[PDB]
């Protein structure tokens, strides 16, 4: 061999194997074989807010800096109606206390 790869073939394959990863499976709020939901017993809006904060912390940890530039929480816009899927509700519409 004589040619050196100018973008760097190991670096490009190291990046694209991380871009290759499939989508995360969000089963939360869906029944199991027994008939129960698979959530965390907390309501939908607080689950969405907690979840955006967790993903902001993950974005901060992913780069080597401690404080994240790009954020998902407290973005300066009001989003008090957003509610993401949790297991407080069932498929009927009632609650899943028991």
């Amino acid at each position: 061999e004589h040619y050196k790869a100018r973008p760097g073939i190991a670096s490009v394959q190291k990046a694209t194997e991380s871009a290759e990863l499939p989508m995360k499976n969000n089963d939360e709020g869906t029944p199991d074989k027994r008939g129960n939901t698979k959530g965390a017993l907390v309501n939908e809006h607080v689950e969405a807010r907690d979840e955006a904060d967790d993903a902001t912390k993950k974005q901060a940890k992913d780069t080597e800096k401690a404080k994240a530039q790009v954020t998902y929480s407290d973005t300066g816009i009001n989003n008090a109606n957003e509610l993401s899927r949790s297991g407080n509700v069932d498929n009927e519409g009632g609650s899943n206390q028991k």
Binding site: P7, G8, S11, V12, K14, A15, T16, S18, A19, L21, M23, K24, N25, N26, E28, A48, E51, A52, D54, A55, T56, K58, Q59, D62, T63, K65, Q69, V70, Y72, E82, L83, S84, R85
Partner: protein, 98 residues
Amino acid sequence: TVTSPYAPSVNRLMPYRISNAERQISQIIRVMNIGNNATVIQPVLQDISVLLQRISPLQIDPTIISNTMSTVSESTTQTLSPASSILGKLRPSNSDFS
């Protein structure tokens, strides 16, 4: 430009032709996967960012701005000066362009 040579055979089977109907329905299912969950959307976006960073020809350094702004060490000798103000505001010594 790729090429793919092959010998003439009939019994060869590689099943890989879909239609736009299936390709759109699976897209709708993948959009319903997200459901305002911010961890579903985060690693896809960040990994596409890193892949563009490793492919992209454009390297960036703020030393162009630091060399154009000739004024250095003014903030404590005089109260205000605009070149030092925009230099300390742009902060060219950071290198996280995520």
